[PDB]
Ligand SMILES: Cc1cc([C@@H](C)Nc2ccccc2C(=O)O)c2nc(N3CCOCC3)cc(=O)n2c1
Ligand SMILES: Cc1cc([C@@H](C)Nc2ccccc2C(=O)O)c2nc(N3CCOCC3)cc(=O)n2c1
Ligand SMILES: [Ca+2]
Ligand SMILES: [Ca+2]
Ligand SMILES: [Cl-]
Ligand SMILES: [Cl-]
Ligand SMILES: [Cl-]
């Protein structure tokens with residue numbers, strides 16, 4: 001029993017982390033097969049990050065300008081290319097620690113683990129969610145760019161995030177592994193800010209199911225509601241609208257606990273309208289929205305990985 | 307920037323996890339050099355866990371009764387011994403993935419990462435603290451026994467916890483890697499319950515320092531206090547007494563931020579007496595006490611590991 005914000009085991013990703021240096025700048029790269037992936041702004045000086053012309057800055061770079069180090073061993077770069085906002089470096093050796101992997105562009109509300117790295121060395125692992133406004137609330141310092149986010153399905157690592165930028169807000173923005181930013185952000189230090197940070201309703205509901213499975217049930221009530229009635233409340237509190245697709249995804253948790261989804265919605269409605277009155281749920285005094293329904297089923301059943 | 311509940315990279319430990327089966331029972335073991343460590347109650351049936359005589363139950367076991375599997379490969383057991391509440395199995399092959407490691411018995415209030423495992427397969431990683439009452443608030447299901455907790459210092463893994471028992475309360479108890487339980491708990495399913503769960507004051511203070519370093523400073527006030535005055539408040543709210551040793555450990559964070567430790571104590575005092583008034587600190591509506599001062603300095607500076 002017990003519920004915790006749980007990250008995937010990071011060993012498979014640790015074996016893919018390398019250090020990439022372009023003249024003055026050092027950040028992290030991801031080494032899979034014979035390609036190293038890193039943020040293209042590695043080719044930039046801090047003087048360039050205001051209005052960089054990435055295509056022009058890359059004309060002055062050759063393969064031998066990209067210094068790639070896997071732990072202690074230097075990799076030989078035999079080609080380079082820009083794909084959207086990521087630089088791909090072809091090396092002459094396939095990473096022997098390459099796991100089975102895929103590249104995935106995740107949807108807002110989905111969760112993933114982040115391996116925070118500096119100078120190609122792993123530092124820590126924690127769980128994140130892609131916010132509805134396409135930011136993540138992470139822990140990233142200077143040098144952490146190129147750290148990746150991922151999910152693990154038994155033996156396969158699905159890479160979904162590469163870290164690029166910290167916004168003035170203190171939240172974080174980045175790309176998928178094809179180099180396309182999540183949301184409207186660009187790899188330029190300009191005036192960009194995050195939109196409304198809406199709460200992921202279906203995740204809060206999943207987490208309430210997780211709470212009931214663990215004995216935290218003081219929030220269950222005698223009420224029910226409808227999708228349209230609940231959504232009037234969700235809107236007022238800057239919650240995402242709940243759809244029938246969300247209800248269906250909660251099906252297994254509804255079946256396991258015998259709590260109708262709309263009954264749980266009426267519990268959430270009361271929590272939003274009245275607060276918690278100084279109580280707690282699964283050790284939290286706030287409503288948690290970075291557990292997906294799959295996350296709750298995963299943890300509450302004990303699924304393992306290669 | 308940003309602060310997150312961050313676990314150590316788990317790869318070095320993943321390579322040490324194995325499955326141990328004794329007749330009917332399967333749990334996890336830790337394979338370091340040519341020894342496998344696991345909870346001794348692997349030799350028990352569910353009928354034995356009420357009043358087990360571990361010495362008598364072990365008389366009927368031989369080396370070939372202990373089935374040890376590292377992923378897919380079976381290990382040959384050439385000796386077995388009981389040390390306190392842990393069973394040590396000598397195998398004929400040294401784990402080639404053995405990291406540099408040590409065994410450490412941690413103090414209450416110290417934190418560590420847990421690699422939750424089932425059938426010798428890693429499932430997830432999360433950060434824990436040894437509570438003042440010698441329990442941990444973890445995420446453990448049946449089959450998770452033998453999962454370990456650890457800290458990583460650059461290249462060295464310091465193992466500090468092995469999971470054994472879930473108390474009726476829903477909290478968790480276990481041993482160091484010499485098999486000595488933390489606290490008064492025993493590996494018997496009897497009437498045992500946790501004592502008063504006191505809050506780790508020095509950790510809350512460290513986390514308030516972490517908050518200021520990130521722009522959450524609404525809780526700073528115009529007040530100060532004394533150790534004895536603050537401790538009158540700590541006692542009332544079931545906080546651990548703060549000592550000069552605690553003040554000294556907070557020195558580096560006090561120096562970095564220019565906030566006198568006793569000034570921060572007056573901020574915590576006001577928070578305890580008035581609550582948060584519906585505000586939040588580093589994304590929490592509660593006062594967090596599972597970050598040590600070292601944890602805050604670690605994350606806020608970017609220390610990495612082998
Ligand atoms: C041996 C090889 C291969 C490539 C290209 C064709 N292929 C890759 C380049 C980078 C990473 C992966 C690959 C790949 O083929 O999988 C490549 N692309 C280069 N570019 C610079 C000018 O603009 C176009 C890209 C330069 C170079 O020396 N290359 C060498
Ligand atoms: C080859 C070897 C070695 C040992 C002991 C001496 N050594 C270990 C036993 C278990 C794990 C590690 C070691 C070690 O020597 O490091 C050992 N201890 C056994 N015991 C059963 C009866 O009560 C005493 C223990 C049985 C056995 O076949 N052993 C075989
Ligand atoms: Ca295979
Ligand atoms: Ca060495
Ligand atoms: Cl892994
Ligand atoms: Cl490698
Ligand atoms: Cl590791």
Ligand SMILES: [Cl-]
Nearest residue numbers: 321401402403
């Ligand atoms: Cl191994």
